[PDB]
Design a protein around this nucleic acid. Structure first.
Ligand code: AGS
Ligand code: AGS
Ligand code: AGS
Ligand code: MG
Ligand code: MG
Ligand code: MG
Lengths: 432, 432, 432, 432
DNA sequence: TTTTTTTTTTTT
């Protein structure tokens, strides 16, 4: 029914107002229909009005396509004529036609991706998406229903807004009291929280301590280590949970009986979730890789995480920018934005680590301007905490956590407090 | 499109009043088109009015043509109808047709000049110009645009200019006396206004404060969130309007009774406007999306916004340049130009935020050179204020606002003024 | 007469010494002639001497030519002979032939340009000059001659040097005596003058001050703006000439009676010109449009320009390069060249205002390595000034001018001088 | 080519004496070419002289030749002419022919060696070299060059080198006795020599003086100015040559009669050179534009300079640095290297000027450490004279010349000398 | 050819 759609795009102002915002060039044909719609779209972009038959003929004469295409477009334009119709049958039929064409294009692209990925490398016609984003494309084929959400009205829609304040399902409480106090109830789902410490100051000890604390509070935690292996992170978690020093495990001061007893005692407790550690090579995982990991975890292991942790965003690969194409600023900003998009998609608290510049190392204070790889990371991150350690603090078994970007509350209040990091047990303890 | 031009010359006075000044027999053709235009020109010269079909046919009978030309003119005259096409498209198309025909005639003329130059001096014609007249014959053919307006005169139009001085309909007050004082009556419609600061300083706080202030004045405000979600921002607007807190909303200190009472009391006010909050994924919107959103808003609800707030220009996506086609100085400036064009098209006050590079994130002052993105943004901008907060300022809850680019008024009359920013209420308070 | 040219290039020495530096491969037809000239040129480049017949037959055998090309070149070489003629008819005939070939090539190139322009976007060739570049090409072809001036030859060009000593070019005086001192009487007719400055520091203030000063001297001034409405520029001029602050005009302190009285008092003065302000959209005007504008200004308004002032060079259209085709440097250089050509053609002092880079903003000193868009502007310009009102000159109500490039005198004599900028009246007063 | 080689072996002497030692029978052919060379070699052996074409025919008349060979030889002998080709092209072309034939023979020999190697060991030729001899054989093919000149060979070019020391082949005198004394006979070709302008001490005056002494000695001088026009520099040259004061020309004291008389008096003298002044914009002339200028002057003006004087090194631009700066060290170091490379590749004496540190300005003594260009100019400069001015030197019309770097001779021999500077005539006179 | 981030280095 392409002829009817074009005719009522021309000879119906009411029809054009609703269907146009959604009409696209890939929904008609590879011949006369697409060319006619391209003519109409160019005229609309140039004059912001629906062209007439004379305007279409003039644009057709000032066009460069061949004789066959010219004749087809001329016949199609000559066949366009308004008919007595009703707005509803046309809008519903157009929605059905657009949905069918979107599904057809999506399945054609799916077949193309499958037949392209099944090719020897270096001859796979790059810039074509991989099989990993096969379902997502189909998800885009179903989100076309002529029902775009205009937005949220402050006065018209306030009961629904008020039924989001006492819900509190968005906030995931910590286990430390100070972190809950500064965040006013803990971190929120669909966010990107960051730890900035430097090199060998913490920043993975803190992530492991957070993972252990969330695990004790009945949470499913997905640790993703882009550098350290799976047994080192698991060893850190074991040291945190079992209250056994990493030196004791290395020096064999803990027996198999004690280890088994502690593990079974933790297992028999109802207030304990599941922690899963996954390792990827440095620069070999992205947002799409994490989504594939999420899907295979949900299917194979029936594991649905809420506290997804990534060891370092700077070590991950952007899923949109080719490697080493853009500078550190753009690449890191894109990676952080994609991670935040993943977090809001799966509705999980995302925790990450970030390096500071060389000038901030061995300094008694770390500012937000000391971020290493990009200034956009603080802009695209919900909460950031700076971990500072000096010789005096190290001798006191304490670290100073400074609130650098506090989006859940006022950062001026409680800006710097001293945590009791214990490096042997990979644990954070409070001083209150 | 000679038929359209002749038909709208005869049957349209508005078209005749803008194209007849620039029209010649050489522009049309050498056959029936030129003869028809010559008949029209002869009739308008003998009688100062546009001829009719009957008068044109009578003149054709009076005038003498050979059989072929007579038949061609009769056939062409038979093909004239009103056909009320758009005026803008018609004038643009006739300008293009005139330009292309003039270029063709100029090329033929210079080719004839070159051919005559090679002839021996005895054989060559003295009427044709020398080769030295080739260039100006070309530039003049490139100065046949349709524009009869010459511009202001400063001595013949001072009365109209004085009347224009009294047209203050472009101004929009600020609800803040200091901002009105420094803008000489508030912001103006169709202008790009920017509120820039560092990361986590209160850019979105200022945007929401401006939205609430415009809402309390009866304006229609369209808040477009790029990083935050739609609901979170409405909470800030509620904290500004209801004037309780941000934490008290999340800590349950407000019962439903008070919330309902305050919302209904604000509904009873006749000085309140309409506020719509729209969220977009990072890097997925521009004026092209904004124009479709405007059309959908106007269709679905009686909402034509007077104020358009964009959460951040940087997070926005340029229309023509791809996601990472060019560097920051280009696409950021392109987005700024597109936003200003959208504002001047919709005649709305456009507000947006801008980021500051790391060099001024901890400085007591910020200059125009401290713009994180392209420096073309402080070229398309009109009132680029700046927010500077220090430890002493945060102690007194008083952000410093520095006038960075002031196109409305004197940038240095009140260069730096203190505000009374309340972070809990997301409100700017004037200081007296 | 290609055969004669080749024959006397090979067999004659004075002819070779006279005509060789001006010969080019494009002056010969694509048959045997161009290939033979290629062989001759390669031999001359490799051995710095005129080849013989044996040399070329050796070069022909050691060449990658097809059978047809080989046969044609061999036949042409066989046909060459030393016909005795006079070395005063040969040189002029060769010059005529070269000029004709250059004109033919230019005609073909402009025909190709016009064919390329009419093609739709995404199919048309890029980097090919637009239609507005056609006359310039035709200006280059007519300049071909066997006489070339590379540098100034002492003892060979000394009459012209004595003329330059004794004669001085006519100057359009300023009203500020300091500019006359630094320019030795003012600015010449066919010049491009630029007043670079930072953003929101007085680019339009200085241009409007110059426009008012020239208007008070009896000149016809055309003010073309792109970032400002006609009423705004005319209000700046009124503030300059009526001695009323822009604050007074906006606030309504002055009445219509006083305004009319002052305007009529200015009208009654005989030493007054005509100032016409024309506004164009950003990127919507070029040199041809300025020419079309000057055309209607000379016709509709019957006004001949004298001090054409382009508010901003960086906004105007290229007129030689398609929009968004080349980089900023090339486009701005092309705009500068087009504007200077327009000034030379119209014999009008042309004043403009470019923007300095972000580094020069709030910098107490600027140099040629501070221009933002293009560093080729000083080469095209004839006088270039700067504005250095950075931090403390604004508090003292003063400015500073660097004199970056002054072709009228010596830049290192009064390089930096202080200007009393008054922003309420939008004028420059002298510190003397 | 073989016909030409044989013809110019028979009918030339220098070509024979140059190419005979590198001529072998296997280089020509297996029919006419080889047999004909065999005749030349045979005769050259029995009678140590070149045979007459008839004597070569006598060789054919008295030699073992098959009917085809004897005929072939007769035709080839009858096809040899005494035509006069240029010697350089002939030698180069016969060298290329010999090299190609030697390479072909060596490749065929190694192919035959490989083919013989892949044969039954009982059945193979013993005379064929083993496979291990293949790399050496090709070497003998690559070691074929009519003339071997790779660098300067000590103990093999000592006689030519002595002729350089006695004839002072590299020195260019100065016309000033003191400058000749400290340079052991003047500056050398392929060198960069700079004068360290101090506190407003000078600006082109010295280089203009150097552009007159060389002119009076018969040298072709190319003066490239950046901060001045051609007329101004040539006026400084006229002041020095015509003894007219610089201000007298501007005032008009000297009339056209005296000027023309002095110019013609200079033109009569045969000891006068040519001066070509070329102007370039500031920063618009790298040391690659100078190469193009030299090529144009050689091709069109036939002007091949021996002295190149650049007005100022700092004003110049680096050929491939992209970013230019008003006063940056990296650019000055690159500019010096590029200019010295130009001097070396053009075998010309290159002169330029550069600024020095304020300390060098305040102190009468200037140290290499006290130089604006540190480790950049006293590293790429063969000679660096420090021209500084003092009020006492000024009151006596003198300038103290100090020698800061002298590759030519000992720097401490005559380091300080007083120069008689005349600022009106722009001249340097000696002091007794 | 400019523009902007980050880093590292070096020169004054
Ligand atoms: N096996 C271990 N036994 C005891 N202490 C350890 C051990 N591993 C690490 N630590 C301590 O933990 C501190 C911080 O460890 P990490 O969390 O690995 O630092 P890091 O910042 O993650 O390293 P990078 O540079 O970011 S990969 C170190 O400085 C050590 O003092
Ligand atoms: N929900 C909140 N509760 C309390 N304080 C907040 C909240 N959100 C933001 N703030 C404070 O508001 C200030 C700036 O935060 P925002 O206004 O959200 O920043 P923004 O303008 O979005 O800029 P960035 O660069 O994106 S953080 C800081 O003092 C924050 O701590
Ligand atoms: N209405 C006004 N009243 C008083 N002063 C004003 C007014 N408008 C502008 N100014 C002042 O004039 C100065 C120069 O403004 P402009 O003439 O627009 O300079 P500009 O370089 O053209 O700015 P652009 O075009 O946005 S880069 C500003 O910095 C203000 O201080
Ligand atoms: Mg780590
Ligand atoms: Mg923000
Ligand atoms: Mg301006």
């Amino acid at each position: 029914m392409v002829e009817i759609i074009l005719s009522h795009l021309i000879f119906d102002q009411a029809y054009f107002s609703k269907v146009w915002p959604y009409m696209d060039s890939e929904y008609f044909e590879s011949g006369p229909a697409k060319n006619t719609f391209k003519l109409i779209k160019s005229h609309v972009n140039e004059y912001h009005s629906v062209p007439s038959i004379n305007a279409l003929n003039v644009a057709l004469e000032n066009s460069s396509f061949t004789e066959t295409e010219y004749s087809g477009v001329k016949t199609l334009i000559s066949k366009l004529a308004d008919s007595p119709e009703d707005h509803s049958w046309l809008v519903k039929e157009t929605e059905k036609y657009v949905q069918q064409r979107a599904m057809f294009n999506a399945t054609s692209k799916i077949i193309e991706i499958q037949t392209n990925a099944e090719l020897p490398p270096e001859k796979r016609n790059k810039k074509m998406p991989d099989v990993g984003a096969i379902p997502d494309i189909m998800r885009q084929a179903l989100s076309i229903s002529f029902d775009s959400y205009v937005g949220h009205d402050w006065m018209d829609d306030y009961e629904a807004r008020w039924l989001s304040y006492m819900n509190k399902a968005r906030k995931v409480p910590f286990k430390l009291r100070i972190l809950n106090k500064i965040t006013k109830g803990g971190a929120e789902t669909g966010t990107l929280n960051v730890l900035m410490a430097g090199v060998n100051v913490g920043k993975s000890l803190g992530l492991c301590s957070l993972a252990a604390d969330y695990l004790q509070l009945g949470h499913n935690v997905l640790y993703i280590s882009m550098q350290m292996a799976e047994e080192v992170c698991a060893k850190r978690i074991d040291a945190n949970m079992l209250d056994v020093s990493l030196d004791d495990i290395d020096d064999g001061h803990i027996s198999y009986a004690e280890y088994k007893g502690k593990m079974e005692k933790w297992r028999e407790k109802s207030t304990l979730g599941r922690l899963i550690v996954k390792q990827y090579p440095t620069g070999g995982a992205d947002a799409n890789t994490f989504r594939s990991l999420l899907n295979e975890l949900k299917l194979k292991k029936n594991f649905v995480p809420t506290i997804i942790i990534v060891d370092y965003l700077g070590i991950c690969k952007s899923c949109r920018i080719r490697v080493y194409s853009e500078n550190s600023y753009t690449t890191v900003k894109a990676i952080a934005e994609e991670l935040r998009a993943l977090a809001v998609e799966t509705e999980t608290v995302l925790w990450t680590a970030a390096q500071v510049g060389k000038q901030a190392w061995d300094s008694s204070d770390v500012n937000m301007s000391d971020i290493a790889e990009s200034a956009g990371l603080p802009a695209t991150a919900d909460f950031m905490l700076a971990v500072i350690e000096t010789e005096e603090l190290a001798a006191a078994e304490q670290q100073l956590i400074k609130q650098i970007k506090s989006r859940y509350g006022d950062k001026n209040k409680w800006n710097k407090f001293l945590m009791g990091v214990q490096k042997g047990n990979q644990k954070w303890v409070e001083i209150e």
